């Protein structure tokens, strides 16, 4: 919110040269000057016979801003033999990717070709140039003896690059191994030392590079964008790479180990064709010393109102926890087709609050289609989902869109003011913009009145210039200011005190003693530090004859401002006030309400609380409600306030409405000083009955009940605090578990069936009969373990009623039978017939979870043929039941739940 939009720095390059496609800061250690490195991949050069060679330009600062190219390579195509060129530097897109660490610059030409030594061929390996102080070398790890598309021939190395803390370079080539992609990581010292201009395929000893995988991994574009950060706590930066076409184009992000190129983590997107992984950043957003991951999906389509898919883009923010897992949140875009998330730039701490901040671009959004940039601030919980600043493009389009925001680079104080600044690329109009960061000032204000309650007869002081007497008090205005970075030692503040805020043409009641107006404005100087160093003034009341409105409080109001011009510093960078510090502050006073006890009023405040929810469950959609009674049996209380305080985990939904018989209120919800409360809002002997909604769940797991506390605090001097009261609601474990199942219902001989000595197939025996059961937990609580039994007739009168075939289970349960399953290797209850018992044991199931059991059996048709011959019938039936044995809540009470169900099947000839 502190980026200076009123005076950005402007840099322009040759027309049509894509000046601004790649941006970075150059901070050499050999001088006190810092440059902007701007890539112009289409800039025409003076190299012999080279058309559209590309350039990198050092744009200076604090001078006549002028960009001069760096002469990395002044030669043209080399010759392999007579009339046989080795290289093709035309349209090589040099400068498409630029990075710089310390005094080292790495620029890359992703589209560089070369003539293979094996045969006359033209392949885009891509190359890079590394400038180290005075030396300049060529780095082409993809120019090795792997020649065809199955090797590193089409590597396009240098598409994305990044330095690390340990001076090791990561380079991504999305074309290696049939466009599987590749990460090649090399030490800078080795690259510098192992350079021979006459050697075309150099061998580096300490090269870490991912190797070819199966043909399924093809067309993955591993290395589209790369980032470096630590994710296994070894102290060595690990490698973060985007693979935007992985997992059926769902896009993925690989994190490889930084010392042996082993796979550490994988992130997967949710929507196809979104280029999840188009841009990746690794920085700590919540100051836990654990690097967090930001992944962009600029083409994310999300569902809005009217169920329409809107292309807005998304950013996945993953926070790194010491357990080795990531907590992931999503941040959707704002405008349609703006491609929010195309560029993700860490900034460090933009406002030096303690938590690092980030910037995310929408290169095709804002007014017209000329791109904007959103600045997000980091908090303890992570990223704040509300941008604190919007940077807007200011350049009319041309043959191609300006693409403001297609590139950024932050975390560098180009101004040396103490606040990191930002660069935005506008290669569509061949421009680069430098946004500087202004210092943020935090200001505290203090306003109080000594008596705060005026007995109107206290005419102690005389109004100056006359002998009349008025009732008067004092008002104290105090200011404190401080900030980080380079700020002037003195700031000037304009302060206005309005002695009666709410009334407006109503006649005021309080007046300035040295004046006759309810407004007083003064200019005062504040030191950055020091003390409050504040003053006080005197105000009074007009006599009773002027007005009759005595009930209305007199509201003292304060506004403060500072002259930005005075503190604008030499460069014209004027400061800014903290975003969340309040600029206006108010106090309230009252005239005496004829209490006359001891020149003040003495209230008596009591509260009571109840509810129908005598006992509550462990966890569900809590409908918890409270009925609260508040009584003031004493004298009237000024600014009486009711407070509800709750233990660690709970939430507040709101005040019950549409209830006429129940008094309504405007209760609100606050959380401050690591304490969370509900605060709600009189005359003597006042009775009020209100209702509130709450959501409470158990997360501490040592007590079998939950508590609530109530408090009353008012502005009264003596009866400041009412006695505290507590309320209790018991916790219960209601794990409502049930069983239900079903049999085909009825079964009818088999056509073309003949008798056999022994059956070998399922059709030889007869038709199939299936029984399906399910044990399901529909209660608001979970259960640990349970058992179920299945009672099934098996044989009767030496006749096989049915023949079990096989089991099937779904869920974490293990079953067992009391008799052999499938005694013959095939490829009328239990009260009067031979029985069979199946006992199964099931583990933990939560609310809505269930375990499902499937049984398939064969019907012995010979028994039913004998039945038809003997002229009788079978009343087939079966039963099942369950009983719970354990609940996961050991400290909580345990109850026994047992039930049963019955199934049947009919057979006819």
């Amino acid at each position: 919110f502190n980026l200076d939009v009123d005076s950005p720095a402007e840099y322009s390059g040759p027309e049509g040269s894509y000046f601004g496609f790649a941006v970075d800061f150059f901070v050499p250690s050999a001088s006190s000057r810092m440059f902007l490195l701007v890539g112009a991949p289409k800039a025409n050069t003076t190299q012999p016979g080279i058309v559209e060679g590309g350039q990198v330009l050092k744009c200076d600062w604090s001078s006549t801003r002028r960009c001069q190219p760096i002469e990395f390579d002044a030669t043209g195509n080399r010759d392999y033999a007579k009339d046989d060129p080795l290289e093709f530097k035309s349209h090589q897109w040099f400068g498409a990717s630029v990075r710089s660490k310390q005094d080292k610059i790495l620029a890359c030409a992703p589209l560089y070709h070369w003539r293979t030594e094996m045969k006359q061929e033209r392949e885009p390996v891509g190359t890079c140039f590394l400038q180290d102080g005075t030396k300049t070398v060529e780095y082409a790890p993809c120019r090795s003896q792997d020649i065809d598309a199955d090797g590193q021939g089409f590597c396009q190395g240098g598409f994305s690059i990044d330095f690390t803390k340990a001076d090791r370079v990561l380079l991504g080539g999305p074309g290696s191994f049939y466009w599987q992609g590749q990460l090649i990581s090399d030490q800078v010292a080795e690259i510098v030392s192992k350079y021979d201009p006459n050697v075309y395929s150099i061998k580096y000893n300490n090269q870490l590079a991912t190797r070819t995988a199966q043909a399924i991994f093809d067309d993955s574009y591993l290395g589209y964008s790369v980032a470096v950060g630590d994710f296994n706590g070894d102290g060595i930066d690990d490698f973060v790479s985007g693979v935007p076409r992985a997992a059926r184009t769902l896009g993925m992000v690989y994190i490889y180990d930084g010392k042996n190129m082993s796979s550490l983590y994988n992130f997967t997107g949710e929507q196809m064709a979104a280029y999840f992984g188009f841009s990746v950043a690794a920085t700590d957003i919540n100051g836990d010393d654990y690097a967090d991951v930001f992944i962009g999906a600029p083409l994310f389509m999300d569902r809005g109102s009217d169920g329409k898919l809107q292309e807005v883009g998304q950013v996945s923010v993953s926070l790194q926890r010491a357990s080795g897992d990531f907590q992931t949140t999503k941040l959707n875009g704002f405008e349609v087709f703006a491609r929010f998330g195309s560029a993700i730039a860490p900034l460090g701490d933009l406002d030096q609050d303690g938590f690092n901040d980030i910037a995310i671009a929408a290169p095709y959004g804002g007014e017209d289609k000329k791109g904007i940039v959103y600045i997000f601030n980091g908090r303890s919980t992570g990223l704040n989902a509300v941008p604190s600043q919007i940077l807007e493009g200011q350049w009319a389009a041309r043959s191609m869109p300006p693409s403001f925001g297609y590139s950024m680079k932050g975390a560098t104080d180009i101004d040396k003011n103490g606040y990191p600044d930002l660069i935005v690329g506008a290669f569509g109009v061949d421009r680069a913009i430098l946004y500087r960061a202004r210092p943020v000032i935090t200001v505290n204000a203090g306003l109080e009145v000594y008596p705060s309650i005026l007995n109107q007869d206290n005419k102690t002081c005389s109004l100056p210039g006359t002998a009349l007497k008025v009732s008067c008090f004092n008002v104290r205005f105090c200011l404190k200011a401080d900030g980080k970075g380079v700020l002037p030692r003195k700031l000037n503040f304009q302060v206005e005190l309005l002695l009666d805020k709410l009334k407006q043409g109503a006649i005021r009641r309080a007046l300035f003693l040295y004046s006759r107006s309810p407004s007083h404005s003064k200019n005062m100087t504040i030191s950055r530090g020091g003390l409050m160093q504040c003053e006080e003034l005197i105000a009074y009341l007009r006599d009773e004859s002027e007005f009759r409105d005595k009930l209305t409080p007199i509201t003292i109001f304060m506004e403060y401002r500072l002259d930005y011009r005075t503190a604008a510093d030499t460069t014209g960078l004027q400061p800014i006030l903290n975003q969340f510090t309040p600029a206006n502050i108010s106090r309230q006073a009252h005239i005496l309400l004829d209490c006359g006890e001891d020149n003040v009023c003495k209230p008596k405040l009591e509260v009571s609380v109840d509810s129908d929810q005598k006992k509550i469950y462990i966890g569900d959609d809590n409908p918890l409600t409270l009925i609260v009674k508040a009584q003031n049996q004493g004298e009237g209380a000024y600014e009486a306030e009711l407070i509800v305080s709750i233990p660690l985990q709970a939430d507040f939904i709101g005040v019950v409405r549409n209830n006429e018989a129940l008094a309504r209120l405007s209760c609100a919800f606050k959380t401050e000083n690591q304490t969370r409360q509900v605060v709600c809002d009189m005359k003597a002997g006042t009775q009020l009955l209100a209702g509130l909604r709450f959501s409470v769940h158990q997360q501490s797991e040592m007590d079998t009940s939950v508590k609530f506390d109530l408090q009353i605090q008012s502005s009264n001097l003596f009866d400041k605090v009412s006695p505290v009261v507590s309320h209790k609601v018991d916790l219960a474990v209601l794990a409502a578990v049930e069983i239900r199942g079903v049999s085909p219902d009825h079964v009818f001989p088999i056509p073309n069936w003949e008798h056999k000595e022994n059956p070998e197939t399922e059709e030889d025996v007869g038709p199939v009969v299936q029984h399906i059961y399910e044990l399901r937990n529909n209660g608001p609580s979970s259960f640990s373990k349970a058992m179920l039994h299945l009672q099934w007739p098996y044989k009767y009168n030496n006749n096989t009623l049915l023949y079990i075939l096989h089991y099937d289970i779904d869920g974490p349960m293990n079953c067992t039978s009391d008799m052999e399953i499938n005694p013959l290797r095939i490829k009328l209850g239990c009260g009067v017939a031979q029985c069979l018992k199946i006992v199964c044991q099931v583990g933990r199931l939560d609310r809505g979870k269930s375990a499902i059991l499937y049984v398939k059996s064969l019907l012995w048709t010979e028994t039913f043929m004998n039945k038809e011959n003997q002229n009788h019938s079978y009343s087939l039936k079966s039963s099942a039941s369950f009983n719970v044995i354990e609940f996961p809540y050991k400290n909580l009470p345990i109850e026994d739940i047992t039930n049963s169900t019955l199934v049947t099947t009919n057979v006819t000839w």
């Binding site: 496609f21 349209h91 070709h113 006359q120 033209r122 885009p124 598309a149 089409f154 598409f159 999305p174 074309g175 466009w179 935007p244 184009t249 929507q271 196809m272 064709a273 280029y275 188009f278 600029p298 083409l299 389509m301 109102s305 009217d306 169920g307 898919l309 809107q310 292309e311 087709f337 869109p401 693409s403 297609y406 290669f427 709410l502 009334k503 407006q504 043409g505 109503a506 006649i507 409105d549 009930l551 209305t552 507040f652 939904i653 709101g654 409405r657 309504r664 405007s666 049930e738 239900r740 199942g741 079903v742 085909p744 009825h746 399906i772 399910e774 399901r776 809505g848 269930s850 499902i852």
Partner: protein
């Protein structure tokens, strides 16, 4: 009652406070009675009926025509939506309803544009379509009578990681290395404009030739975009269905995929097909994103069909889930089954309708209640499916406003996706009364002027107050006789304002306006969902967070749309539950899931099939008389005399009917999604 504790101050506030309030402004001034409460009250209390102001919502059809019955060549008489333009009048707090009819006209004109990938693997494919035109004509003759056929081809961008250049003579013939011949790489080329002479298609196919690609994903999205947007070049008819066939063999390129080729300019959606019919910006314009493709397909009313080989179906199917109106099919490796696929796809995208809103103001909100075939109403959703050609469906829509914005007249349209016809709604608001035309500022009718005579009580200026403005800030008389107290003991204006000469006036505020004769109401303390704020899709007055028509709820926190809640079979929540406000909740246990279709304990399907079989076989049962039994029979029914037990997953069932006979039936579904069933002609 309401309209009395609030409003009263002026006619405009009386209109704006609530829809059912009224106002009467007779010059008689019958004081002691309210002028704002209700219409029938103003009828009595000896207030002039001709001075009673009470606008009410009114919607009347402006342009409407009967639905067409057979559109086999009518130039413009073809109609598919019966109301085409209506005028909507809304008092700026209320809502009203109107109906729409949508019909699938028989024998509608069809324009098919066949787009083909032309890689080398497509070569045999190209050989199998050499006679496609005549077969397409003879097959679509029975469906339409205005068939138009166009042809276009694509391989991939002739740019960087696709073909670049080659040091040998492969530039003019890439296939010489394989001792064959082929064309050089081409991005997209328009080949045959939509023509009604079918034989030209065949004549135009024999001269085609494939090109060598580096395998890899193709460039079909550019070809699709250019086919949609190039209106004149391709030759789309406005009053005709538009099927865009897209036949491919391998994977596809996406937007931002051309950055490897050096292309960073986004697709703009315009037409870049020159006189040579070759896509000129192929080497300069990136691939189009699915959002842009969906937008252009909706704008141009093109229905997209993905004819792909099996290898990649599970990809394109998933892609079809991000572009509504797309139909994916199976295509043989020799592409010998493409015609059947196209016939099935055309027959399947004509079977469902779907309404969309265009140019809807942010102020407005709509609620839809659909009525599908068999005269069944399924409120909450706007899309009907399962239709057949010649069928007609209806929808009811009510439109509600939070208030009225600065503009007085606006317009929008309700259009079925894929159709030409639409309904144009012109909405207007009666924000102000009729009496403002006789306003007299500072007239002597108002004491010392100082205000305005607004068809009744004077509106006092600054410093003046009270009825007739007889009191001011120079007098501030405390004698009040208007019961300036909401409750005994309670402050005169609830501490939110002050009583001056009989009436409360509310003092300053920080983050919201204050309304009411007792300063008892505001617009900032409304009840809020999750304690944040009143969600915004509705009114926030007097602590009540009212909601829109499409955002209804106690806290405005769960949409009433029923788009998620239908099951894939074509009915709501699998017929076991109801959509409450966005999630199917089912009333029977042993059921769970998004639509409660996951019920394991539910019985076999033939149990629910038995009543449908009885209905389709014999005339008995109350459900047969009520014809609600037709709802169950979603699958096609055929009468047979032989058991068609041959099938991988064919399901049989038996029924012991009331008679001694036994009913036998079978069913199964196929890959095309059409589920069929057979009933034995005579019961056993």
């Amino acid at each position: 009652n309401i309209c009395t504790t609030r409003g009263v101050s002026s006619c405009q506030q009386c209109l704006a406070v609530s829809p059912m309030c009224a106002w009467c402004s007779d010059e008689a001034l019958p004081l002691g009675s309210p002028r704002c409460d209700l219409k029938e009250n103003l009828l009595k209390d000896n207030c002039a009926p001709e001075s009673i102001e009470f606008p009410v919502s009114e919607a009347r059809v402006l342009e409407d025509r009967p639905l067409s019955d057979k559109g086999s060549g009518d130039s413009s008489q073809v109609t598919q939506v019966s109301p085409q333009r209506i005028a909507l009048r809304l008092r700026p707090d209320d809502s009203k309803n109107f109906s729409i009819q949508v019909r699938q006209v028989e024998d509608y004109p069809v324009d098919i544009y066949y787009l083909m990938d032309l890689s080398y693997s497509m070569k045999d494919d190209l050989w199998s379509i050499q006679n496609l035109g005549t077969k397409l004509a003879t097959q679509m003759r029975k469906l339409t009578s205005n068939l138009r056929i166009g042809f276009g081809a694509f391989v991939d961008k002739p740019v960087s990681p696709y073909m670049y250049i080659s040091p040998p003579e492969a530039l003019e013939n890439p296939c010489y290395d394989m001792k064959t011949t082929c064309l050089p790489m081409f991005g997209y080329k328009h080949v045959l404009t939509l023509t009604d002479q079918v034989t030209r298609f065949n004549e135009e196919v024999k001269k085609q030739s494939v090109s060598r690609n580096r395998d890899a994903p193709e460039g079909g999205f550019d070809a699709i975009m250019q086919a949609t947007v190039c209106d004149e070049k391709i030759g789309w008819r406005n009053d005709a269905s538009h099927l865009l066939v897209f036949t491919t063999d391998a994977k596809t390129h996406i937007a931002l995929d051309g950055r490897l080729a050096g292309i960073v300019q986004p697709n703009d959606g315009q037409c870049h097909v020159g006189s040579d019919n070759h896509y000129s910006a192929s080497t300069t314009m990136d691939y189009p994103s699915l959002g842009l493709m969906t937008e252009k397909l909706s704008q141009k009313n093109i229905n997209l069909i993905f004819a792909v080989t099996e290898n990649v179906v599970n990809l394109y199917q998933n892609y079809s889930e991000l572009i509504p109106g797309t139909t994916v099919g199976v295509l043989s490796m020799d592409s010998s089954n493409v015609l059947q696929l196209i016939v099935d796809a055309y027959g399947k995208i004509r079977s469902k309708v779907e309404l969309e809103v265009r140019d809807l103001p942010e102020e407005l909100s709509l609620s839809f209640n659909a009525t599908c075939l068999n005269n069944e109403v399924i409120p909450g959703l706007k899309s009907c499916m399962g239709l057949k050609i010649g069928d007609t469906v209806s929808f009811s829509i009510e439109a509600k406003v939070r208030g009225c914005p600065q503009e007085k007249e606006k317009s929008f349209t309700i259009k079925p996706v894929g159709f030409k016809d639409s309904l144009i709604v012109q909405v207007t608001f009666d924000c102000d009364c009729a009496c403002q035309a006789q306003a007299e500022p500072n007239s002597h009718r108002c004491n010392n002027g100082n205000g305005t005579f607004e068809c009744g009580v004077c509106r006092c200026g600054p410093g003046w107050l009270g009825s007739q403005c007889e009191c001011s800030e120079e007098d501030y008389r405390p004698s009040q006789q208007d019961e300036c107290s909401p409750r005994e003991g309670q402050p005169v204006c609830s501490q939110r304002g002050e009583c001056l000469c009989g009436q409360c006036v509310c003092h300053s505020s920080d983050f919201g306006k204050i309304t009411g004769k007792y300063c008892e109401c505001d617009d900032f303390s409304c009840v809020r969902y999750k304690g944040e704020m009143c969600s915004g899709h509705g009114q926030c007055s007097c602590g009540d967070c009212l909601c829109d028509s499409d955002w209804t709820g106690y806290y405005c926190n769960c949409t009433t749309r029923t788009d998620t809640c239908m099951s894939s079979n074509g009915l709501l929540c699998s017929g076991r539950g109801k959509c409450e406000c966005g999630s199917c909740v089912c009333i029977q246990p042993g059921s769970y899931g998004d639509t409660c279709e996951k019920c394991p304990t539910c019985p076999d399907a033939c149990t629910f099939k038995k009543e449908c079989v009885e209905c389709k076989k014999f005339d008995r049962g109350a459900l047969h008389d009520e014809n609600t039994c037709n709802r169950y029979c979603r699958d096609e029914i055929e009468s047979v005399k032989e058991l068609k037990d041959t099938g991988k997953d064919a399901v049989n069932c038996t029924y012991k009917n009331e008679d001694d006979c036994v009913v036998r039936f079978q069913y199964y579904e196929d890959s095309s999604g059409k589920s069929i069933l057979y009933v034995v002609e005579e019961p056993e």
